[PDB]
């Protein structure tokens, strides 16, 4: 059960982070504003859908290894380790900055969990690799808005009132 | 027939406004230009499709209460009460400003019609509520491009040659 | 630009005629009455859909050759050259007669445009050929209701109060 | 429970009428004969399908407000208030006349129920408005076969052996 | 092989009749004219499709019992036993009369084949029963246009220039 | 016409029984209650759909052999020969018992009709065999809830308040 | 803005309740156990999907009336007014009891909101009626497992270790 | 009408050739035998479907220019100009050789018709170009089985009993 | 029960044979090798799917007549009466020869069962006819690879190392 | 080839176990009886489909590493290592107990194979991880019926004649 | 063969240009960066798909006129006549400028080919017209981002670090 | 960045190889000739589609780890390490031999990359395992045409002018 504990911990911690991202992507989807609001509205709906699918797969995997899955709102608030997204109307450049950082740090933690459970539970490890893959992709998709090129640093001045993001 | 007249008037006036919006969204869809042209191209196609569906439902409702439906081009021009959209290539910021105002004022007039016919014809009133719902949504979707946030007033300078929209 | 002018003129004039037909087929779709009303209701919806698709392709082609597309209601009314359809409840035999004549004359004008632009702009000419094809088909479909046969002149007396159409 | 009684009564009475219409449209669908038999065959199948969907929604709403739904054949026969459709081969003009009258009178009774329950049960009232909408549409679709126009009274002589319907 | 001969004969004769009907329904589909032309256009396309499916099943069954299938144009012309449909524009009432008679007589012959092969080849007999079912249905659908009712003999005068069909 | 009478009788009697089952499965679908209510809700919807399809095929076959189809509510009540299902909330074990008996007895009567018409009308007989097949399947699906096994008599005590069904 | 405040309050309070239900139905979906676990697993997935669709529509409506939507996890926890669902493996009878009570009380509060906003904002009121409709349906679907019938009180003893629920 | 005659002749002659190919591809589809029988079975079904679609378009075009379409079996036999395919079981190499020649010669004749009608009827000419395109593609697909390569002359010895095709 | 025994025996024996064919077609699907391996791979997948559907229908029919269905692996091995397919890589010509013989002999036995049960159980007999139909079709599809034609005996030398199959 | 042997052994042993499960889930699907029979009928069909997909992927992987796949019925019987499921009508509680144990032990053996081949053949190991994932999920779905909760031990007494499973 | 040479040359040269565009649109799809990166990501995927479809049609046409198609990577590099797209992260404004120029010049060359082959090979000419149509459309879609309007020159300063593109 | 370098190198090298295979499978798809040309045409289209999907996933993964993706034609030619496929008409046996060797050697190199990056980047390693899986499958599908069996060495003499491949 010291092996089982490892898997359960890794899965539970991943479920909570995805659920936090679920709620944040949807909040941003509705509240985003500015030049890129519609672009981000659509992109975040796609992210919401991929995150939602993996939140299901994670919980199902917990049940599959014989553990109860804790997907409750209180647990999402409690088992934070991650900033809440601001309320109110959200600027496009603020959404981009927010998820660039959130996806990067969630991807990092899943990366570590993969190594922690590979030896005891390669099937769980394998699911977590798939989650890490989608989260790093979503990180790229947010990163790309401000990605430096030979011809243009893309500082975001145009989407952030003349100021670099 | 003083009750029937109310319903017919409310439906006819709504049909004409939707038909005007049909033609304007499609014109903007083809002619829009600038940084947001493709974004608006796609968004306006979706608006065109929701407006078209409600233009059908309105006409069908007219026939259902026993009145002929006037959907002719001459009637659209005649029964204006609404600015025509400019010809030529249209700037993205001009499209945004145009529909922000058009959807708001069309939504306002449908809002009034709902109250005018609720008592005599709640079924008609109910259709008009659905039309008001979609038009106010589309108003939001245009509004959002220039919506003020704590971090960025989103003046549209970036989509309007350095000038606030 | 004397070559470009030819193409733009042919496309614009075609767009306006299709848009006029769009509005007329839909008006007839809702208002048609009599023995054939449901038959025509369905047939005209199909015609509306094929005309609508070609109104899109025409406008897109205008943009593709570098010209703005004028699809506004005022332009439809202005750039007539074609009778408006009557308001009110419409008899089945009157719808049949109306579109038999409208499709024939629209097809004739597109036929001429094809020849006018084939040499400068065969790609545009080719689109216009496709439009002419659908309009002549729709002409047949209306014509067929009153088409003379060895066994029956099909005068339309049965759909026109005992009188030949 | 004097409020609950109102809702249950309105829903039950609506369910029975839709079920009666279900059976009558299908009977007519199979047995209709004459020039318009195939037209009516198809139209009545569509009406059957929309009525069937609303018969489901009505029963479900009854269960939702906590009442049993009575959809039995005996109840349909008992809780008449509406003519049965004749057996045997049915003429097209007789089908048209029959449903023109049946849909009009069913629509009228649902109209009244909407007002009776709006104050206590706006959610039920709202469903009944949707049912009234479809029934009035179907009334139009039957009415249209004999609708008077400037050019043709459409007496139905052609579908009724030379006699006005 | 006296048993095999029976099956092959029944299948081949059925294939040829269906192929003849294939070509005739399609010819009528294109050439039909008058008040019912569009109604018949659509109905005959559906008949064409059901006949085509059974022409495939019949040929496949021939191959399945180990015999070559003769579906050639010369065989259709040769192995007539059935009137050709007239060329030229065809009146709606003439199409109705033609298929009423053709489907009835084809159904009759398949009926006989079923009995001829039931004992040796119930699987073939069973396919032929399915073909007989569709052909008798199509016979009804043509018959229904002129079916006598208590209120209207439906003589077809309205679709046949004032003359009973 | 002594042969035709046999077919018409067999088809009509089958149509009425299916229509009775249509109404009863739907009533049970809405009103069923207890541990198995949702299971039965879904199962009975599937049964409703298969019965409905065969009620269509039966009526169509009646028309195909040249007879009017009697699908009216009065005929369903009249041409009983079968218990009505109780009104009110229905227990799961009562639904199971009811359809176990109804499907068995309907299947038995169709079995007899098949033999009665095989010689005159094998195509009709064949349709009735398909109806008998689905009804016997549905009988199994209800039977299975209380089917005796080596390890458990399945008396239904658990779904019937501690009492064997 | 005293009218706008009413609408915003009603919508926001509804959004939060649906989001709470979203998380609870999914938790129950994964963790439910016992005889009815699979039945409830499937049923709760359907409820999750209908609630999710309405959580989207509510937020969109908030944006449409010009207000930011607060869908954050902290707000769900804060703006409780509703019990959290227990963690751990959940018994089928406990899930049934939980949602029977939760849906009933959520439906009650939405019922009140409808009346509060009907006069100022009938379009919002109308959305809330649709939400109330689905929540009352889901209440029925949970209620039905323990619904009293003439033949069986359905106490749930069979799904609750021999004890009435 | 000397221009109309040209178009009608070109269309009619094309329709007949496609109809001949329709029947021949299907005959070959059923009767083909040998190593490549299944390959050819599938390929010829695809060819049958593309030819069938163009046989429809050709006939429709005839009607569209105001002429009756002659698609009768007698006309297919009469207006030959093309070999009939042999009856009986057909060898794969014989099918390949047959259609290689038939498609090549049909494509050649359509090529000529295109030039004959381009000036009077570019819309018809354009349809005929599309038919020529598909027929030349199908010619390639048959040709390819015996196409000479640097490493292998592909004489067909393997599919033709050791003899070059 | 002497009648029931007949049906059960015929169904059970058919189920086992189809299950044997299920496993053999799939084995051949994976292991087939040579010039025709891909052709056979695809063809055998289609055969697997049609056989699988009928293995379901047979078992369901057993349950429908009130008997348990024995579909266990031990029963497939036991209730042989049919050669097992060789293990290892399988040559295309060996697959063709194998199924040509297996389908022919399975079809023969089902043919006999049809006659054995027609009188007691025409509904079962009818299912078995459908199974016999598909098995004889599949027999043709294998036979066709080596079918003798006027121009080529198709000995299979090309797919069998220069030797006739 | 000592590395290849490992992979082939792991794949073959997995294929056989999945094929055994294929046949057992389907047998249970048809024969299951009692309160949960329909629930299990549906659940086992889903399990059958996921197992079938993985039986295909496993065999394909064997071929991909260059080995023949042994999927024959004799091999399933021979290469047991697993209990056969009983014949006859099966009780719901017996099905639940059977697969709870079978899936657990199959999952355990695949778990071991993953470790055995990870180093030589990570691609094969990866497929086997996916198989282990689905089998452990299916284990959960069977386990859940008798899963202990704070409020109810779920002994299965209700589905097992008053006795704990 | 001087006519054949013309067609082959025109087709081959077109194939190579489309293949070059295939690779460039996909490269840009992955590497594009900045405010418009996601907009362009999606747009370029659509362009990739339309170009890919025409690269297939062109090659197929080459085979159809009896010539081998050269679609190899070496030929794409060799038969340049067109700039390669830069490696590395690409700015949105650089992608827009690149394809604006590439599509314009590819469209120009196809325009010329159409004239070169119209007389010998109108079917090929016609395909090339369709390719020219899509390429000119894609040119518009890139052009539109910087299209001058009465209210805004759209210099691209906002997407190009404050500098006009 | 010594870890990042490893991943980028492995991904880039894989992307280039897949892109080379993309172009080669499509070239072979169009140009393949002989007895197996159509079989290979279809098979290679499927291979093209699976390779294309993985070329997308690889590039996306490169972007996801923060590196630019080089998918340019020059890079495909440059970063060869693999033979180009010959131009001109290609014999079936030459296509089979070519891809048998190409897929085997590409699969081998991806196998090595998996090991090189597993420790630093298991998510990348995992994608590469999926690519290796599809490439080894495609290798089998080409291998199978010439796979040795107990009854036939399958030398390919029949597809290679009497000579072993
Ligand atoms: Fe509504
Ligand atoms: Fe059948
Ligand atoms: Fe074209
Ligand atoms: Fe994976
Ligand atoms: Mg901003
Ligand atoms: Mg601008
Ligand atoms: Mg009239
Ligand atoms: Mg009549
Ligand atoms: Mg006539
Ligand atoms: Mg009970
Ligand atoms: Mg319990
Ligand atoms: Mg041969
Ligand atoms: Mg061989
Ligand atoms: Mg039990
Ligand atoms: Mg930039
Ligand atoms: Mg060769």
UniProtKB/Swiss-Prot annotation, chains A, B, C, D, E, F, G, H, I, J, K, L:
Location of this chain's protein in the cell: Cytoplasm
Region (Disordered): 149-165
UniProt GO molecular function: ferric iron binding; oxidoreductase activity
Ranges annotated as biased composition (Polar residues): 149-158
Keyword line: Cytoplasm, Iron, Iron storage, Metal-binding, Oxidoreductase, Plasmid
Main location class: cytoplasm
Catalysed reaction equations from the record: 2 Fe(2+) + H2O2 + 2 H(+) = 2 Fe(3+) + 2 H2O
Oxidoreductase found in the keyword field: yes
UniProt-listed Enzyme Commission number(s): 1.16.-.-
Function: Protects DNA from oxidative damage by sequestering intracellular Fe(2+) ion and storing it in the form of Fe(3+) oxyhydroxide mineral. One hydrogen peroxide oxidizes two Fe(2+) ions, which prevents hydroxyl radical production by the Fenton reaction.
Record-stated family: Belongs to the Dps family.
Subunit text: Homododecamer. The 12 subunits form a hollow sphere into which the mineral iron core of up to 500 Fe(3+) can be deposited.
Descriptive protein name: DNA protection during starvation protein 2
Covered range of the whole protein: 72 to 236 of 241
């Amino acid at each position: 059960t010291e092996d089982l504990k490892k898997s359960v911990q890794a899965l539970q911690n991943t479920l909570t982070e995805l659920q936090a991202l679920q709620l944040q992507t949807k909040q941003a989807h509705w509240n985003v504003s500015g030049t890129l609001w519609y672009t981000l509205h659509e992109l975040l709906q796609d992210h919401y859908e991929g995150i939602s699918k993996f939140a299901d797969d994670v919980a199902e995997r917990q049940l599959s290894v014989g553990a109860s899955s804790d997907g409750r709102a209180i647990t999402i608030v409690a088992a934070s380790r991650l900033p809440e997204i601001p309320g109110g109307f959200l600027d496009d450049a603020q959404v981009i900055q927010f998820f660039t950082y959130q996806y990067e740090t969630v991807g990092q933690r899943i990366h570590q969990r993969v190594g922690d459970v590979e030896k005891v539970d390669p099937t769980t490890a394998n699911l977590l690799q798939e989650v890490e893959h989608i989260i790093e992709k979503y990180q790229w998709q947010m990163r790309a808005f401000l990605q430096n090129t030979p011809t243009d640093p893309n500082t975001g001045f145009d989407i952030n009132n003349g100021k670099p993001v």
